[PDB]
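Hello again,

I reread your note about wanting to compare the complex against the isolated chains. To keep things tidy I'm splitting this into two emails, and this first one only covers the full assembly. Below are the input lines as submitted, including protein chains and any nucleic acid or small-molecule components. They are followed by the predicted structure of everything together. The single-chain runs will come separately.
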Amino acid sequence: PSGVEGAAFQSRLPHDRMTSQEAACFPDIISGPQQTQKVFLFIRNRTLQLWLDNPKIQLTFEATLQQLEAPYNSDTVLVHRVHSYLERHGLINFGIYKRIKPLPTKKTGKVIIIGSGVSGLAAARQLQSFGMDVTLLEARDRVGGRVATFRKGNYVADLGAMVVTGLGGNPMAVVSKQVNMELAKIKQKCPLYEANGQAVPKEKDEMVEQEFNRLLEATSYLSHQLDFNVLNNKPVSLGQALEVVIQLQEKHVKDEQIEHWKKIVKTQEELKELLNKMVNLKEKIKELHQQYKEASEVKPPRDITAEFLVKSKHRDLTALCKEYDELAETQGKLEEKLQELEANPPSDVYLSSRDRQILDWHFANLEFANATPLSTLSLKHWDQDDDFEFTGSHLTVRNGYSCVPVALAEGLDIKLNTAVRQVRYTASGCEVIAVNTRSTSQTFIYKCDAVLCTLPLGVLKQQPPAVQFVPPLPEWKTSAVQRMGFGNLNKVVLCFDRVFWDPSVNLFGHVGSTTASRGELFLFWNLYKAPILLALVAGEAAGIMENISDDVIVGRCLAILKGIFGSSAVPQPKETVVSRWRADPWARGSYSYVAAGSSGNDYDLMAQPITPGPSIPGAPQPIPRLFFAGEHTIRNYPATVHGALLSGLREAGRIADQFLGAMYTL
Amino acid sequence: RKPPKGMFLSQEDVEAVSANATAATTVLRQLDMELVSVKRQIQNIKQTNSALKEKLDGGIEPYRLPEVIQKCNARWTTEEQLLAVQAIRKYGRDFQAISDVIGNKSVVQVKNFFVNYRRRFNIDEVLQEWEAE
Ligand SMILES: Cc1cc2nc3c(=O)[nH]c(=O)nc-3n(C[C@H](O)[C@H](O)[C@H](O)COP(=O)(O)OP(=O)(O)OC[C@H]3O[C@@H](n4cnc5c(N)ncnc54)[C@H](O)[C@@H]3O)c2cc1C
Ligand SMILES: CCOCc1cccc(NC(=O)c2cc3sccc3n2C)c1COc1ccc(OC[C@@H]2CCNC2)cc1
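Full-complex prediction:
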């Protein structure tokens, strides 16, 4: 994907098409002739290209126009409208750049942003870029929110967001050019090591992996073509579907066994009547035989009745024995047809024992990817964001992912250690109430024209509430938060003296001994240049591991990865840290997931800003005062950092469009 | 619109597994019972089989007797019509079961032995007491 169109792809827009948003902004173009919207499309993704070839500097309207050409540079009022459209919604001139034109001397309007997570930093950074004053309010003593790197000495390991998922169509493909981000590459191959400590053979790996995958598309079949969705008036989760396709497959294996042995017997007793008819054919071969020979011992001469008797009974033996022989060959074609019907037994079991704790390992890292047990994931919608996943391959950030938010926080006033306990909004304005989180008596009152809420969805689910809204949020939002899922997954990072593992493998797994513990330290990660290994606790294990001590968790670590590489082959780590995200009051979880009974629409519902009621009854209805960003907001890029900053960018654009007006709709 | 591999999923069973909580276990368990059931039926029938398979030891070979080699003869001496009318008295219209007892007459010259020496041998009168019984 290159040319002026490669910008359109990289910017997550169609090329030959026109999105609903630019339709709202450019209704004349979309309702007009085909040619005019074609030229508009060109102008759009062209200026996109110019921004994408050098993200490290702001491109102005005077930077583009002269680099267009007829008959595209002919209409300037339109290229002004498209440039002033794109920077507004953060498709161009976003993130970190050096701006040629120094900022407005006086700001316009006021918004305060709750929380310094990357979505909040994007929103505030571009709102400042737009000529508004912004202030950021953090409960934490540091920025970055759910991107958190551990840095001690040369040891850096991130407990938050680690890998970027593809660079194709990634907004952070440009920030990786804006900030110093050395993107290394994970290596896809994962060896699975059993509970004994020695690796699983390759044939078993392939067998269980393809089986696993095919159970997944089995579930997809259940949803889409069989509409197996509600059960007992309750929505089904892909955990339940996985167990029902597993059960159906085991069931089949059984009933094909029975189908096989039924026909081996039903050809076998069809041998009964035949050789019963053989025994009671033979005994009369004997009786008639001594009849014949006692007839032939009558000695000549004979009257023709006796000669008749001997020759007739002679034929009666010489047509009887042939109906012994032909069905010794009819028999003879039956009884040797039972040992090949024996020699093709159907598979003894659908699935055996030890392999279930391997396929359980695959299920486990599935529960890791979604940060929740498969019991909770909506079967229909859990993969809904898979269509929008990027191209290229997943890249780790070795110097730590905290380099990007601290890079954004440059130039903004972040007020750290101030926890917002109340958000108060009406038609005249907003005032939020904060508390210094060190000395909790000290209270702060901020007033502004709008507030943008980056609060993680876990803290919004908190009951009794950590942040009170006056007036309370409307039911349609609060219930959307209630039915949305929030997952948990945690990392144990271990710091040794040197590498006792294979430097070639970046990640290696360990299969648990039961379905219940399948998420317990199932895979380990060597992605870092220091002697750093970090194992992931996920699934339902992550929730249980938080309330038990750290030294027993690292104890279970070293226990596991001793039997992997040998007992003396491991040191004991200099220092270790474990994450507990669900216990974090500023997280209350890890990232979101669509729960059973939820859907993608809920994300949409959580993006919708909230307008107050009219102050004086009978007044013109007020302006939306309260806005929402964060990973739980962007629908088709949820639970990612790129999705977060995309939300922050778009609602920086929406805040601006409301309080600065939109001059690009002419 | 089809399962990805040799997995089988279609409506009629999934409702049988979802009928209640234990429908899975109760649906595979009586299948296991019906499996070992017919399996013991097998081993039973095997064991009855080997018994009369033992009863068939030696085949019929002591009761086989050498086959007669002969050439078909055109005419008749007087014995094989006295043989013939007796053979059709016991047998009737089964001719290759007559051609054999005579033995020097192949099949087809037994049937033209049904329309010529007839009212002499009174053959249709001897043919219906093979029909009476
Ligand atoms: C273990 C883990 C691994 C992850 N790995 C990846 C990954 O590999 N790739 C990826 O794309 N994404 C990953 N993510 C998810 C990603 O980190 C998040 O989606 C994103 O960083 C969240 O940004 P945010 O601004 O939306 O939320 P946050 O970063 O949580 O921002 C919210 C901020 O508000 C503050 N706050 C909370 N309560 C209050 C309060 N009462 N008053 C004032 N301030 C408050 C918080 O301190 C926080 O700083 C991972 C997440 C976890 C937990
Ligand atoms: C392609 C297989 O690569 C294996 C591998 C190795 C090392 C790190 C990671 N990957 C990671 O460490 C990782 C990447 C991302 S993005 C959000 C979380 C997260 N995690 C844990 C991976 C797997 O990559 C993904 C993992 C989870 C995931 O989730 C899908 C989205 C997130 C929630 N909603 C659907 C997507 C890719």
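For quick reference: Residues 1-133 of chain B form a domain with the Methane Monooxygenase Hydroxylase; Chain G, domain 1 fold (CATH 1.20.58.1880).

B.
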